[model samples]
Target: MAPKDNTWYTGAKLGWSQYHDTGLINNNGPTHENKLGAGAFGGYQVNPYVGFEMGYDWLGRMPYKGSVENGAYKAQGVQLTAKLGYPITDDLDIYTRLGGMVWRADTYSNVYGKNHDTGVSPVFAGGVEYAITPEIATRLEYQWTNNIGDAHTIGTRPDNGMLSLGVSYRFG
Candidate 1:
């Protein structure tokens, strides 16, 4: 049997996400940058300081109307992360997560037409969690994904970001 403080956990979050102007969709003109996004993840706390997790995130879409192009760009993916944490108190923890995402993107335009791309990218996140009780907690997190597409093929590749609030539960 495992120790009382070590266990498995799962969480879900909702937030806003934005794309860097360097992305293919935004290069043509102004873009719909801020969008609603969400994600869910589950992991095991191997100890007080380290754990592993995996999850999926939908970063929503960016729709644009440009003189030369008109359409939308959307992204979502699955990720695997390693988490490191430090407890500030019995009920509070601040942590950092480092991970990689296997991502897929869909983009459409009147001029460039419709295209889809898939690749792997690195992601990073940092957050804080406060336990409402031993098994439940509130969470705030910010996550970033680097260059989501192939610039050579898509014309541009932008970094992405998301800020979210959610809840988590630990399973004994």
Candidate 2:
């Protein structure tokens, strides 16, 4: 598909996502922990199907019982993504994206003791969008991210899966 205008590349978007972190305890048992969050992103389209993006995301704390931890850990970080999209029609498209980021978690006490950790991880996602108008559209996406650095020693890496819905606005 061709770009809407003669402009080289430019667009901005915002979205909300809910993340489920698995393998939080030991990579076994009680595998579903949900965290609510949101993010904003901006990009420059090199072409209709390819672009570069920067975004910020957050994950709220989890609720673990019996532990001093009243809530789940929080994560905040920046990411860079390469976006790929295909237009199914003049007003609809499907896309896939891959990216990387640095993540940090707030300290919390477990059965053992209090611990704090932060590290970099890889993030990936795929989604589709439909244009409601020439300058506006809605999207649905799924994303996955992992903390490879500290998971080996910290029992299990926080592996996260997220589903999101968003709106995008295009500009020249």
Candidate 3:
């Protein structure tokens, strides 16, 4: 059957996530960072399987110990994703997405100078959505964000990954 014609609801989602950074540090020390974040998104559905989304995410402080400093770092940004979904039944659907995100990080330190960096990278996400009603659904998704920038003040590059769970509302 063709998908149900329920594309008239506005879409909005809120989720919490966690990520790990696998960037290497200078001095042969392992530099790893863990991040906790949350995000919210809203958009309009062009069809059941396709939609355009815009979202804002805030990543909590990242701390580095041992060789690196012990302080908090914050990242917040905006993203755009093209959503693709497949219905398993009237109540459940699976989806995946590819998108680009722009973000800025606030650096803190006593040794390293205070720094601010901006990054633009691709984000990938996959998840399942369950409809509770014609206008509401819950989602659980996994998202990965690649950090395309210098690992340190002067060093190599690294990437990050995240997992999130969210709920969305559909409206025209």
Candidate 4:
């Protein structure tokens, strides 16, 4: 789709993700890994001051390598978010996002097939978007998603924090 002059738009983003499990997976006596993550989103500008969006995320894998009996944690989900922005200039916008995600995680060994841990998380983010053109923009953002409802994790609920850079094209 092509971007229009009005506030409504659609776009896609490319970025990596990171999740911290407080070394909960390492208790199995292996090193903890925070693998590279990726996600994509499409949404609306709504108005000059506010917006809404939804997207899917891919959290490759959280693996624990052990001497034997190895296991990993993998996560993916749908995230719905609200965008509130403050205009720093005609070309720059700083914003915050508050929303929740329903994550379906495979907390067991990859040797298994089906996913089991499905839960909801409160999500938050803050970022800055700069318009390169009326229809194009680039953004730097940080997102935090709570992993409280995820099953099969140890200790307290771990936090999922991700930082990413993306380009967006507003569409009609």
Candidate 5:
């Protein structure tokens, strides 16, 4: 059994997410689009080293325009799993989360119209959370979902990745 230091929590987070597309390339080599994203989660700090989490995150529709073409893509999903955290200090914690993700991705292009797909995939994320006052916290996280969209339709790998900075208020 794990040691008990129980802290149950519910919170909402809002941030700007950057979608890195290994697939979407115009005349430029690579592209990263800006998406304003938000989410809410409930978690339990079962111990200091680990926690359980369930959350929903939305990567808002980020559209891009090239000189002669344009496109847009967006995705949202639920992640259910565990988070492992290491405290670097009294107010800072670095963490990584692994979980199952059920996601729906939508893509639209000037040439190909639109395509939408829903699938389940593995989710991987890493972030650092800093406690401002114990009741409030801020974080920066990067998350990846493999194979959320059809590869040939969207761009390169068709996987979705987001780097986000968020603020959350804790409730216990």
Candidate 6:
């Protein structure tokens, strides 16, 4: 059988996410560092080696118990990335992505009060994919978004990272 001809693909993924530090809430007591994260992405492959992708992600939340009060910080973003790929084998590929995320973060605290901040941050990722069939594939990816919130507004800045597994289907 001939290989499937594909140009457009979309996928969904779930994973664990963590912030490098407390972005808004203070670490006076305890904090949840890792949380559930998820994302969906779609793209058009310009060729076998190059593509452009856009995705929306829920990067997860950080909840902390402060000395005086309890608070939570949450964030989400939409990102556009350029993907470069190389085939190591007929069914296996390695890739890297570079992009920027337009992100929004919200924080709640008795001391810091309620705050919302928005900014754009650079994102980087690398992953590997294995083709299960002519039109279906699965991937494991790790991504990082740097300095997501404004310190003047949210009171701190932190980098966020996620590791995920996803499946994609291409139209034949």
TM-score of 5: 0.75
Residue 172, candidate 5: how far off, in angstroms?
3.3
Task: Give per-model TM-scores.
Answer: 0.81, 0.74, 0.76, 0.78, 0.75, 0.81
lDDT of the structure predicted as candidate 5: 0.73
- Per residue, candidate 5 scores C-alpha lDDT tens digits across 11-114 of 66765655534453545632456777788787887888898889998776566655565566777789897989888888888999899988887888677899
- Sum up the clashes in candidate 6: 0
| lDDT of model 3, residue 22 | 39
Q: Which runs in model 4 stand beyond 4 Å of their true positions?
A: 1-6, 22-28, 62-72, 108-115, 147-155
Q: What tens digits encode model 6's per-residue C-alpha lDDT throughout 1-172?
A: 1123347888888877765455343434554466677889988787778888899987556454545555666777899999888888999989999999898877776766889878888999999988899788898999887663545555445575789999887775
Error of 3 at 116 (Å): 0.9
lDDT of 2 by residue, 98-146 (tens): 8898776664544555566576778898888788776666778887875
- Between candidates 2 and 5, the one scoring higher on lDDT is 5
Tell me the deviation in Å of residue 139 in model 3.
1.0
Local distance difference test, each candidate: 0.77, 0.67, 0.69, 0.71, 0.73, 0.76
lDDT agreement of model 4 with the native: 0.71
TM-score of 3: 0.76
Supply candidate 3's per-residue lDDT for 155.
45
Give the poorly placed runs of model 5, Cα more than 4 Å off.
1-4, 15-32, 66-68, 109-113, 147-156
- Give per-residue CA lDDT, model 1, range 60-148, as digits (tens): 56554556545666777899999888888888889989989898777776777889878888889998888888778888898887664
Model 3 residue runs over 4 Å out of place are 1-19, 22-33, 62-69, 147-156
Which stretch of 10 consecutive residues in model 1 shows the poorest summed lDDT?
19-28
Q: What TM-score does structure 6 among the candidates reach?
A: 0.81
